[PDB]
Amino acid sequence: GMRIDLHSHTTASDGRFTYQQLIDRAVSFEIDVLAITDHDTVAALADARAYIAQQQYPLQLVNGIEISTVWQNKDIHIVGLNIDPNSEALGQLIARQQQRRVERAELIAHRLQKATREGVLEEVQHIADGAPITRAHFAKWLVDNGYATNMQQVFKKYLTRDNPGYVPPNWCSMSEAVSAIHAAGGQAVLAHPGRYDLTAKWLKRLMTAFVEAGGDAMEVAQPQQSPQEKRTLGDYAMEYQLLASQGSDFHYPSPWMELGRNLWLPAGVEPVWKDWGLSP
Numbered sequence: 099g100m101r102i103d104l105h106s107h108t109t110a111s112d113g114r115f116t117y118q119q120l121i122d123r124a125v126s127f128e129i130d131v132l133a134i135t136d137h138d139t140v141a142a143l144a145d146a147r148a149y150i151a152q153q154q155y156p157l158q159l160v161n162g163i164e165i166s167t168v169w170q171n172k173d174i175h176i177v178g179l180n181i182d183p184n185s186e187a188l189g190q191l192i193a194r195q196q197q198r199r200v201e202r203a204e205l206i207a208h209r210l211q212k213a214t215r216e217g218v219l220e221e222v223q224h225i226a227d228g229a230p231i232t233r234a235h236f237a238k239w240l241v242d243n244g245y246a247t248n249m250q251q252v253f254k255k256y257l258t259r260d261n262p263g264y265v266p267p268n269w270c271s272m273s274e275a276v277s278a279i280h281a282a283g284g285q286a287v288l289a290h291p292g293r294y295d296l297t298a299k300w301l302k303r304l305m306t307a308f309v310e311a312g313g314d315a316m317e318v319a320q321p322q323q324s325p326q327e328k329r330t331l332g333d334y335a336m337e338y339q340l341l342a343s344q345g346s347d348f349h350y351p352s353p354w355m356e357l358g359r360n361l362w363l364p365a366g367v368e369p370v371w372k373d374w375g376l377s378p
């Protein structure tokens with residue numbers, strides 16, 4: 099059909115590729131449709147679209163965003179697809195979220211410093227290079243200074259619940275994120291549901307709350323994932339009347355990560371792009 103990837107990041111958030119480098123890579127990997135879904139920002143989207151046109155690439159760019167929200171005291175990520183980057187409602191939410199991120203980074207650095215060494219905040223600010231600061235920026239600092247062996251080990255030792263540097267979530271609500279994405283003309287997507295580490299009971303509660311908030315879709319496919327896991331999440335999407343999304347969550351290349359990799363949907367699920375009028 100088409101090769102589609104609806105979750106990726108640039109250096110506007112915690113990706114390591116500029117939007118130009120991400121787009122060049124997508125073209126080389128024959129991606130037909132790419133969403134850029136940076137964390138609590140839309141700063142790359144207008145320039146990315148202009149770059150594609152200037153380069154005469156055939157890639158279809160989907161305007162996106164990844165919004166941190168709080169639900170039942172958990173950090174839940176809601177992606178918006180086909181948003182208007184100039185939306186006033188969305189821009190106001192982005193400004194509030196970015197102010198929260200400044201305050202949160204100060205507190206995370208304050209706590210992480212007690213378990214590591216002085217200078218955490220200023221050096222993580224250098225890593226973020228003007229982007230809104232995320233846990234991934236702190237994780238790189240932790241790896242680069244030998245407190246963890248890789249980005250996967252970081253979160254077993256730091257930043258997460260019951261580990262040094264943890265700060266509880268203090269974001270907008272899921273319903274606020276969904277309302278703002280809709281006001282910007284987009285579809286709201288419950289991102290990476292398996293990453294929340296919830297029991298089936300709690301995952302069903304989350305999906306119910308997301309539907310009740312007006313949510314449109316859930317990510318069913320990601321690169322590191324078994325067919326059975328896809329089948330279970332596809333069953334949930336069907337049961338809860340949600341469309342299915344797919345995305346790599348690319349931040350940088352690795353043996354286990356690539357644009358478009360392992361992004362297929364199981365039988366019966368309706369894709370989030372069914373009414374986008376795409377072509378290969």
Ligand SMILES: [Mg+2]
Nearest residue numbers: 107112232234
């Ligand atoms: Mg990220």
Ligand SMILES: [Mg+2]
Nearest residue numbers: 164175289290
């Ligand atoms: Mg996320």
Ligand SMILES: [Mn+2]
Nearest residue numbers: 105107164347
């Ligand atoms: Mn992401």
